Design a protein around this ligand. Structure first.
Ligand SMILES: Cc1cc2nc3c(=O)[nH]c(=O)nc-3n(C[C@H](O)[C@H](O)[C@H](O)COP(=O)(O)OP(=O)(O)OC[C@H]3O[C@@H](n4cnc5c(N)ncnc54)[C@H](O)[C@@H]3O)c2cc1C
Ligand SMILES: Cc1cc2nc3c(=O)[nH]c(=O)nc-3n(C[C@H](O)[C@H](O)[C@H](O)COP(=O)(O)OP(=O)(O)OC[C@H]3O[C@@H](n4cnc5c(N)ncnc54)[C@H](O)[C@@H]3O)c2cc1C
Ligand SMILES: O=C(O)c1ccc(O)cc1O
Ligand SMILES: O=C(O)c1ccc(O)cc1O
Lengths: 394, 394
């Protein structure tokens, strides 16, 4: 079996890269461990930066998003009784963010890939990577007991945090940066009207709470929860009572609750590897870095990594400028570190940490008061929230 | 002995409050433990916000400052080889800061107080405060062996961090917030031309360094130093070699060194007490809060506390609105907490901390890169650096 670009993983990263490449005439094959049904069962993210919205349009997979996605011009932050709205549009110079679920984006891409007939192998077991520094790297995998080999020019590791691609680079070539937080988020998807037209991040003494949405009739809520909690200890009833306790009264009063469609606990973490490539292997998305979901940068960093990789592969194939691929990491990392700093900052001011002394609590409260009450403070949040500009390469 | 306002301490706070009050017709007596010579030997701070510059003018003690002080429109931050200038004037909407030493301000006030004949008792030993909640509080002290009593209406505790006034409030009425940093600043005063027309804060891998000044022929430099260091372990020669090692080469190359006039180590700390008053006693300056010197807010918070206390005492005496004095703490604390947050922030991004893991070092470097390269980021530093607006009271 032979292709130009082998893509490990059929999540947002792999599918988006694959569609962009296909549309440009660059053959690519995607290998996925799971079934399409399993991939479609993941709920996850719901906020898209303008940059990712444009990338989807460029990949020609935006009809459903332009119809069902909700454009948001502001977000609210609630702390100490008050609610402060950050006008993203005004403060960022006119940029907005789009709420359209990660599940929906994935379904749209899977649908577009099937229609075009590009190759996708689901249930590709025991995927292994070889000859990464050769002129001809290859991938071996198993489809129903028999071991097959796939030859290619390049390999894009879009296999997420637990993927095989990052594990295939000699550990000595990689520098890891990581921070584990002492809490996770318990999320709940409900077929109920959202409590607000815009998102609400809430810093409350009992912990963080977030009111989000997927459409006019589907809501998504999250509450900060200790690492020790098991999802089976949280009945729907317990969740609503707790969400309500963390929100301002005028918001909790008008909350329409209902049974959960999905409920899960995701732990918070920061992780970056440098470089993000080795020979003919390039990491993209969760395979290369993780951010706590507080700034909604996860799916968005995957998109920029992909936008950068795709434009560099295009130069390599169409223009014969294969040497530009050496710049991938440098380019991606500048954006990744700023998104990591923003996500770290949002996380530290909105959540309640266990070992907190009095001085730090007061500093946390003051950060909010300063950033939310100063025009310059609001602009730092806003420009970071809509997404800093993608670099153009060279 | 009888007066209207008893003032404990003849540092910047007490003298400024005393001059303002005297000029308005409100009698006040200042009690100081040390001699005038001892007070004048302290070097300390050198940066004044516009607010403090206006307060000095209002107190009529600005002739020398208007002549010898240097107005600065920007400051530089050096990190990772580069130097970035923050245009304070442009970014703050036209505000600047004035470099005029704390020693000079103190000398100017002491001179003005002597000329007007207001009462100042130096070497007032064993000062004690009594009947703080009565209608008539009083102060007792010792002048050459004999114990004297001073009756008054109000007492202003302007006695610094180790003063007796904060110690005189029942510990149970006070809430303390404090953070001790694992380093101090080794400062050096030299009769040499400063290396730059503007200040330079430097984040270097060996530690923080700061290039400041007092005039066109007098310089002040500081280097971050461990808590374990003794000043006698730092010869002038050792200091210059170390300063030079922490600065960018084009700056170190042109540094004019020379023997020290003064050299001392000051440890870094944050401290706030709430409330800042008890009965007829009001705390002002270092007696109520401490900030690390990184943001130069120490002497500046003393000035705002004083400006607030003076305007409230004026209302009380001239207008009979004695009830407004209950608002002192609330008003002062809003400004103190924002200055504390700023000083904490400056401190954490410019200094090298001992227990730092890789992720944090990268986050520290990114904070600098973001704040120094974004117009909104630069504006947060600038507005905070020139000094947030004084509240007008009511
Ligand atoms: C559990 C979890 C919860 C999240 N929750 C949120 C959230 O609530 N909000 C938010 O803002 N962000 C959240 N995120 C982040 C956001 O969803 C991710 O950044 C985004 O999914 C990244 O996309 P990706 O394509 O890089 O990886 P993924 O979506 O993880 O997809 C990678 C794919 O590779 C496949 N794969 C793995 N190993 C192999 C292999 N060995 N061979 C072949 N295929 C393989 C996997 O099956 C998977 O399909 C969450 C992420 C995770 C892991
Ligand atoms: C050692 C030190 C170094 C500093 N270095 C810097 C620096 O390098 N840069 C910078 O930006 N800021 C620095 N600061 C901070 C800045 O100088 C202070 O915030 C400023 O001096 C506060 O003024 P104040 O009037 O409140 O107190 P102070 O200047 O401390 O004066 C209070 C006065 O009260 C007197 N007193 C004390 N106890 C009694 C008593 N029991 N009875 C009567 N009188 C008493 C003291 O003798 C003293 O004269 C420094 C402060 C200190 C303590
Ligand atoms: O899923 C969401 O809708 C959501 C929204 C904002 C964010 O920060 C993280 C999230 O998971
Ligand atoms: O003394 C100074 O000149 C000086 C300047 C700036 C600052 O942050 C702290 C300082 O002590």
């Amino acid at each position: 079996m032979k292709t130009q670009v082998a893509i490990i993983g059929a999540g947002p990263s792999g599918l988006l890269l694959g569609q962009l490449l296909h549309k440009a005439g660059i053959d690519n094959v995607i290998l996925e461990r799971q079934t399409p049904d399993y991939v479609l069962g993941r709920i996850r993210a719901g906020v898209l930066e303008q940059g990712m919205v444009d990338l989807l349009r460029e990949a020609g997979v935006d009809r459903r998003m332009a119809r069902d996605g909700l454009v948001h011009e502001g977000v609210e932050i609630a702390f100490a009784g008050q609610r402060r709205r950050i006008d993203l549009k005004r403060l960022s110079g006119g940029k907005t963010v789009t709420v359209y679920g990660q599940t929906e984006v994935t379904r749209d891409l899977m649908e577009a890939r099937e229609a075009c007939g590009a190759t996708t192998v689901y249930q590709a077991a025991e995927v292994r990577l070889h000859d990464l520094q050769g002129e001809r790297p290859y991938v071996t995998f198993e489809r129903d007991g028999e071991r097959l080999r796939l030859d290619c020019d390049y390999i894009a590791g879009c296999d997420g945090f637990h993927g095989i691609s990052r594990q295939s680079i000699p550990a000595e070539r990689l520098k890891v940066f990581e921070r584990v937080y002492p809490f996770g988020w318990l999320g709940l998807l409900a077929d109920t009207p959202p409590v607000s037209h815009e998102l609400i991040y809430a810093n409350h003494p009992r912990g963080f709470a977030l009111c989000s949405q997927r459409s006019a009739t589907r809501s998504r809520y999250y509450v900060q929860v200790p690492l020790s909690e098991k999802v089976e200890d949280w009945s729907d009833e317990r969740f609503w009572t707790e969400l309500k306790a963390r929100l301002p009264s005028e918001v909790a009063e008008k909350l329409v609750t209902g049974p959960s469609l999905e409920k899960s606990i995701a732990p918070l973490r920061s992780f970056v590897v440098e470089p993000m490539q080795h020979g003919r292997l390039f990491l993209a998305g969760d395979a290369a870095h993780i951010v706590p979901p507080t700034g909604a940068k996860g799916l968005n960093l995957a998109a920029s990594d992909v936008s950068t990789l795709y434009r560099l592969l295009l130069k390599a194939y169409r223009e014969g400028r294969g040497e530009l691929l050496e710049r991938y990491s440098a380019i991606c990392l500048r954006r990744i570190w700023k998104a990591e700093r923003f996500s770290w900052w949002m996380t530290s001011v909105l959540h309640r940490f266990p070992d907190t002394d009095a001085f730090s609590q007061r500093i946390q409260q003051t950060e909010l008061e300063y950033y939310l009450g100063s025009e310059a403070g609001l602009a730092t949040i806003a420009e970071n929230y809509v997404g800093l500009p993608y670099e153009e390469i060279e």
